[PDB]
């Protein structure tokens, strides 16, 4: 009968092309991954420029100057915090993937801040496994033109779907019907791409409210 629009954010950095001239295969693998990541960000930006009316209304609230920095302020130390919109609407906010933290701290200092020399293949595979989710999110958004249903595992995993069930404004008997039927509350959910502004990628997930 009712939806529950959450906000899922990803910290997306912007890295200029690394001027490294490296013939090592491990350097080239990381450069290929970075060129795939930058192309994913560019394609995600290119997308932005009915059961989705409740999720678009949050996409346009974040279109205001002074609404995405408040969402960043709240998550500044917590992965799941409640923020207040300009309309007074309370919206759960979730930070799933920190790609800015990984790229700025581990990759950039040893690749572009100095002459490139990568000593580990573990970080090549580790980057490939965390950047992989971002590439899949772009693939489901580019094919479906920004609105993805049924809700996939890449957008919202099962571990992070029971977190937005115990944190919902419903009774403890309606959180029993949805925590035991995860595979049914995923075919009736949505995912709307909202914005890439101020180095943050945010999309809205509409989990349903079963009031009957």
């Amino acid at each position: 009968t009712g939806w529950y629009t959450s906000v899922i954010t990803i910290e997306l950095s912007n890295i200029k092309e690394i001027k490294c001239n490296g013939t090592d295969t491990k350097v080239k693998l990381i450069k290929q991954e970075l060129d795939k990541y930058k192309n994913a960000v560019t394609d995600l930006q290119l997308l932005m420029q009915s059961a989705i009316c409740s999720g678009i209304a949050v996409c346009k609230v974040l279109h205001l100057e002074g609404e995405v920095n408040k969402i960043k302020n709240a998550l500044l130390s917590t992965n799941k915090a409640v923020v207040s919109l300009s309309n007074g609407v309370s919206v759960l906010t979730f930070k799933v993937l920190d790609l800015k933290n990984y790229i700025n701290n581990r990759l950039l200092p040893i690749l572009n801040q100095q002459s490139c020399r990568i000593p580990n293949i573990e970080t090549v595979i580790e980057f490939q496994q965390m950047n992989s989710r971002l590439l899949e999110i772009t693939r489901e958004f580019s094919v479906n033109a920004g609105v993805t249903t049924p809700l996939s595992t890449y957008m919202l995993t099962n571990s992070e779907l029971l977190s937005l069930i115990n944190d919902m404004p419903i009774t403890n008997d309606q959180k029993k019907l949805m925590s035991s039927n995860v595979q049914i509350v995923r075919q009736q959910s949505y995912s709307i791409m909202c914005i890439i502004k101020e180095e943050v990628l945010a999309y809205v997930v509409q989990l349903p409210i079963y009031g009957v």
Partner: antibody, heavy 116, light 107 residues
Framework: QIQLVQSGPELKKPGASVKISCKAS????????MHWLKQAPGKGLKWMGW????????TYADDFKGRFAFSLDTSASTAYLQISSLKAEDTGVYFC?????????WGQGTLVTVSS | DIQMTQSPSSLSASVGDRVTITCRSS??????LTWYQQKPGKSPQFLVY???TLADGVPSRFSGSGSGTQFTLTISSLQPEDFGIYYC?????????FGGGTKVEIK
């Protein structure tokens, strides 16, 4: 390591114009918009509005309309402030600011002095 | 427009005092407050991210607490390196308004 470098002081006449530049180096200029903050002489701080560094559409506060216009050149990574039809209290210090995680990040001071 | 005010517009503490600087608001702002420390003839650097989080590079002596329509900035123990004019500015919604400005003097 985000840096906002601004212009220097100017000394003008009532009716002249002042062109204040604010160069933002350290981040992709398209992401964050530019906010302008006027300090009154001896008084508190005033907030005029922001200029979107992606589209270029400015918005002003109800007190700062009529003589103030924001402009920018996205290729040079600079933000421009032009004051036309000058008067004698436009004087003070002018700041260019961008959003940090919450509060503002402020530029330096470009004192504007109106003589007679 | 949410309008802010500060009670101790002229504060003069000693070198070992614990002072409180407060703000009100005409409207309700949900834990969206920041404090600036404008040195005399320079640019105002913030000290607090949200009303209960000190900024990076800011001494832990600075701390804030409050939500709704009443806030407070607390200095655990003053030191001579910290003196200036303090402003508290909401960023809930536009236009943003600053406080009257507290000139923390020295006793």
């Amino acid at each position: 390591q985000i840096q906002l470098v601004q212009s220097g002081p100017e000394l003008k006449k009532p009716g002249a114009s002042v062109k204040i530049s604010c160069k933002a180096s350290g981040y992709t200029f398209t992401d964050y918009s530019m906010h302008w903050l006027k300090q009154a002489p001896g008084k508190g701080l005033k907030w005029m509005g922001w200029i979107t560094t992606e589209t270029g559409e400015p918005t002003y506060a109800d007190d700062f309309k009529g003589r103030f216009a924001f402009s920018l050149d996205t290729s040079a990574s600079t933000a421009y402030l032009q004051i036309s039809s000058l008067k004698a209290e436009d004087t003070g210090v002018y700041f260019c600011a961008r959003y940090y995680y919450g509060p503002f990040y402020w530029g330096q001071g470009t004192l504007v002095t109106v003589s007679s | 427009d949410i309008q802010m005010t500060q009670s101790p517009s002229s504060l003069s503490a000693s070198v070992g005092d614990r002072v409180t600087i407060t703000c009100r608001s005409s409207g309700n702002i949900h834990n969206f407050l920041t404090w600036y420390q404008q040195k005399p003839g320079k640019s105002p650097q913030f000290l607090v991210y949200n009303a209960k989080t000190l900024a990076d590079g800011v001494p832990s002596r600075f701390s804030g607490s409050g939500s709704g329509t009443q806030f407070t900035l607390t200095i655990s123990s003053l030191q001579p390196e910290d003196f200036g004019i303090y402003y508290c500015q909401h960023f809930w919604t536009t236009p943003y308004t600053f406080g009257g400005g507290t000139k923390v003097e020295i006793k």
